[PDB]
Design a protein around this nucleic acid. Structure first.
Ligand SMILES: [Mg+2]
Ligand SMILES: [Zn+2]
Ligand SMILES: [Zn+2]
Ligand SMILES: [Zn+2]
Lengths: 147, 56, 263, 57, 49, 61, 45, 113, 67, 48
RNA sequence: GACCCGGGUGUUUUCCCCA
């Protein structure tokens, strides 16, 4: 019924093995005179409503570095947007939420190695990043082939 | 890293640094100023490190 | 009762004829040589720098496939059976590769001869990548241009071809019996005449063709098997054959011990 | 298209990432293995499990 | 200068061949994202009617 | 550093720049654009100089 | 604090999250991050 | 994603016995043997060795599924012989055959070296 | 992209014969004769060298991203 | 508060000897470590 | 004793997959 049998040893030797790249884009938006988004590693204290993934793979500038293995739901771009502060200045020792998280997580079903990170400026002069992820896909039961 | 700064001219003024006499006993010299010299581009650290700044 | 007769012998391939053995024994020997003789192959790659145009895992896959000399792999232990923390010298061999291109013109080829054995078991002849001669550069691994460098450290472990095809010592085992089809084990497709439409086997001269008036013999069994064992250079042909026999013996002895200890 | 396109099977957990069928049931489903996909629905009650095992099996 | 620039960019970006405020009743799908899965697919896409 | 300071440093290093493949390609492209502009203006005198400059700069390997 | 590489002249430098995104020596607008210093290991399979 | 580890083809878990024997009561003097982490290599060898013994009246094996590394063997001997003794005799006989084969190959290789 | 180390079908090492194959073709030998001279008998091995396309020579023409 | 979470770790015993990973779950006596070599996450005892 | 979280657009359009 249109199936086929493949040699496992040929697969081990590199038959029909391929390479997969996926790129992610993000940029800093401008909402007003002085309301800008920032690429940064958000902290559990100064930001609220963080993603459930892990932020420990981000660098100081909020961007992951190439060569780092990533898994699903990991944060590859760290971005925060400002929020008007609440009355928490009552008795909080500077530990009050002023920013909201807008980070970009890796897709839940995908994982791989960070291949190349690009940082530049858009037409408007704001920061603009692109992250490319690389993985290898080996043939297995269910993959589609054709003559 | 900093020779092309506009303020570097006044920054380097009066500084004391180790100098290769060449004629080698290293000695200290006092910077009386700097003077850009066109056409005297020289390798600073590598081949690509062309520099026109000169230290008097 | 079993007999062996060698036709051609070389360091890399032996062509021999088995006789007075069952077909099952010959096939089990072929399967054991193909996928159950332990060899040594690179199993971990630590990439300290790779600025070449090839992906890191591309080069890792290429490295894993390079055959390494596995003569004394019997003395070596399996990685999972070594009580040492991390890897010691008795369960792993460490090779290191460092390649670089100097100058602003030309292309540098990275060959398997550049793999340098750093550490391994004492006085055991294992780990060195296989070379055809003293002047053979070996397997082409990568190519580099100016300011591209490859600096890696590879660890070789002992395993069998069941786990991954890179540990297989043999390339292809030709296997053949009954060139003249006296046993009628196959029925020959044809258009006009089946005799002149099918090429003769390469061992057809080693057996007398059936007589025109001969009747079918229902009491006969396959008795003589012709098989050629080709190796990748990690093990010699005689070593592959002998170690396949020894592996089969060990498997049967393990079954026997299990039976005797079951009671 | 017809009521034989939904039938209740018994689960067997297996490795790899594809649903596996005995080839005799590929006729009522009008399915072959060139890329087709099929849907699986899990009953969540004793009553529903009994209905599936006694009616749609 | 924004009129022509924005009109051309919008029509080429979205594929709706017309003015932005008349998106309905305009011929859609004129402009498509180039298929770069393989070389033959790109060549086929560039010669499609 | 500011944007203006970066531009000034880049111009200074361009004055110091003896040669760079990317910059040579950019210069050749700019020269070709200037040459087509001169061609469209029917200036037979400028185009000769631009052609000579392009011939001198070119001949890559 | 973190290294960067220019997209045209391949010149290494660093930024302090306040400098304009630009190569210091050729003024290119596109820069790339440098590889991580962590250990990278592959199964060679 | 769901692909099992390759070492599970031959590495035996601690809680899984290598060799489980259960009697088959439908016919007299018959046992069912379940080999774990084995395949046609051992099974066919054992089956074709046992098929030649005059006191073994039924021997067969099957691999239930190619994706699981095990096989099950059915053995059934005459009244005098216990089946497990026949299995042990088969193992020992094949071991002797392999030993003499190795010796003869070594002799021939040394002659033709 | 670059010559495979092992033949896919059987597993013979063909990764060390690319340079020799090109040298033989340079001298005017036919492709079949060149493959025969390298002792590639099985056609499964012959297709590996015969149908290989060398793309790394095109990737290397791009300026390296670091220095 | 599980100080070994999000820390690079190496496996010294079992079927994954000498593989670099990162600890993801640290409930207790059974650590979930993602492997850098393949794309998978495995449980492992703390002693390993 | 310093103690760890829990959230996700919408509307169009296009190009694909299995019948
Ligand atoms: Mg179909
Ligand atoms: Zn050890
Ligand atoms: Zn630059
Ligand atoms: Zn082959």
């Amino acid at each position: 019924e249109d199936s086929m049998i493949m040699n496992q040893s040929s697969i081990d030797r590199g038959l029909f093995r391929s390479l997969f790249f996926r790129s992610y884009m993000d940029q800093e938006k401008r909402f007003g005179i002085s309301i800008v988004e920032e690429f940064e590693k958000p902290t559990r204290a100064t930001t609220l409503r963080l993603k459930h993934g892990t932020y420990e793979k981000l660098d100081e500038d909020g961007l992951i570095a190439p060569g780092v293995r990533v898994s699903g739901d990991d944060i590859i771009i760290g971005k925060t947007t400002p929020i008007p502060p609440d009355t928490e200045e009552l008795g909080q020792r500077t530990k009050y939420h002023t920013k909201r998280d807008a980070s970009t997580p890796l897709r839940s079903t995908e994982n791989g190695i960070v291949d190349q990170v690009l940082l530049t400026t858009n037409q408007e002069g704001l920061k603009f990043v692109k992250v490319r992820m690389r993985t290898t896909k080996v043939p297995q039961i269910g993959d589609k082939f054709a003559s | 890293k900093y020779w092309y700064y506009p303020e570097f001219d006044d920054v380097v003024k009066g500084m004391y640094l180790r100098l290769n006499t060449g004629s080698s006993p290293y000695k200290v010299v006092e910077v009386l100023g700097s003077q850009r010299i066109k056409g005297s581009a020289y390798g600073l650290n590598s081949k690509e490190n062309n520099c026109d700044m000169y230290l008097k | 009762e079993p007999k062996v007769n060698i036709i051609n012998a070389q360091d890399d391939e032996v062509e021999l004829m088995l006789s007075d053995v069952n077909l099952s024994l010959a096939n089990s020997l072929r399967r054991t040589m193909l996928a159950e003789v332990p060899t040594l192959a690179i199993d971990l790659v630590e990439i300290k720098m790779n600025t070449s145009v090839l992906a890191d895992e591309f080069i890792s896959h290429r490295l894993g496939l390079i055959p390494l000399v596995s003569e004394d792999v019997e003395e070596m232990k399996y990685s999972r059976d070594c009580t040492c923390e991390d890897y010691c010298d008795e369960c792993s061999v460490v090779l290191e590769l460092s390649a670089r291109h100097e100058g602003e013109e030309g292309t540098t080829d990275v060959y398997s001869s550049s793999l340098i054995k750093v550490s391994g078991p004492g006085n055991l002849n294992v780990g060195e990548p296989v070379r055809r001669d003293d002047y053979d550069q070996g397997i082409l691994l990568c190519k580099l241009r100016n300011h591209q460098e490859l600096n890696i450290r590879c660890i070789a472990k002992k395993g069998i071809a069941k786990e991954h095809a890179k540990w297989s010592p043999c390339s292809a085992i030709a296997f053949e019996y009954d060139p003249h089809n006296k046993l009628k084990h196959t029925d020959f497709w044809f258009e006009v005449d089946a005799k002149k439409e099918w090429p003769d086997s390469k061992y057809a001269t080693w057996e007398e063709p059936p007589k025109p008036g001969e009747v079918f013999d229902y009491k006969a069994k396959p008795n003589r098997f012709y098989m050629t064992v080709e190796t990748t250079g990690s093990l010699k042909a005689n070593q592959v054959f002998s170690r396949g026999i020894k592996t089969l013996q060990e498997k049967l002895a393990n079954v026997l011990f299990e039976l005797e200890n079951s009671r | 298209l017809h009521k034989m396109s939904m039938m209740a099977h018994r689960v067997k957990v297996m490795p790899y990432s594809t649903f596996r069928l005995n080839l005799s049931v590929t006729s009522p489903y009008n399915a072959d293995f060139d890329g087709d996909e099929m849907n699986l629905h899990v009953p969540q009650s004793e009553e529903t499990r009994a209905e599936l095992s006694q009616l749609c099996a | 200068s924004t009129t022509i620039t924005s009109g051309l960019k919008y029509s080429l970006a979205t594929g709706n061949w017309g003015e932005q405020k008349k998106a309905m009743s305009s011929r859609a799908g004129v402009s498509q994202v180039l298929n770069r899965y393989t070389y033959s697919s790109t060549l086929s896409h560039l010669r499609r009617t | 550093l500011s944007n203006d300071e970066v531009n000034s440093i880049v111009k200074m290093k361009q004055s110091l720049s003896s040669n760079t493949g990317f910059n040579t390609v950019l210069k050749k492209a700019q020269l070709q654009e200037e040459l087509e502009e001169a061609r469209d203006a029917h200036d037979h005198e400028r185009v000769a100089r631009i052609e000579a400059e392009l011939k001198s700069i070119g001949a890559e390997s | 604090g973190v290294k960067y590489t220019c997209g045209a002249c391949a010149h290494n430098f660093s930024l302090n999250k306040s400098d304009p995104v630009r190569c210091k020596e050729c003024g290119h607008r596109v820069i790339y991050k440098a590889r991580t210093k962590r250990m990278i290991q592959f199964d060679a399979r | 994603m769901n692909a099992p580890d390759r070492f599970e083809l031959f590495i035996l878990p601690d809680d899984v016995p290598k060799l489980k024997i259960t009697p088959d009561s439908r016919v007299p003097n018959c046992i069912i043997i379940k080999f774990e982490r084995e395949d046609h290599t051992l099974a066919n060898l054992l089956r074709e060795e046992l098929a030649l013994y005059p006191d073994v009246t039924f021997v067969a094996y099957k691999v239930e599924h190619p994706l699981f590394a095990n096989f099950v063997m059915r053995l059934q001997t005459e009244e005098g012989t216990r089946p497990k003794q026949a299995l042990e005799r088969a193992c020992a006989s094949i071991i002797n055959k392999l030993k003499t084969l190795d010796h003869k190959f070594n002799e021939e290789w040394n002659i033709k070296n | 992209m670059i010559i495979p180390v092992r033949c896919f079908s059987c597993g013979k090492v063909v990764g060390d014969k690319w340079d020799a194959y090109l040298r033989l073709l340079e001298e005017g030998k036919q492709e079949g004769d060149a493959l025969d001279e390298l002792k590639l008998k099985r056609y499964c091995c012959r297709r590996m060298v015969l149908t290989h396309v060398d793309l790394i020579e095109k990737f290397l023409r791009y300026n390296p991203l670091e220095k | 508060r599980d100080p070994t979470l999000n820390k690079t770790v190496k496996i010294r015993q079992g079927g994954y000897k000498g593989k670099i990973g990162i600890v993801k779950e640290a409930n207790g006596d059974r650590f979930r470590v993602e492997l850098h070599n393949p794309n998978k996450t495995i449980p492992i005892p703390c002693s390993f």
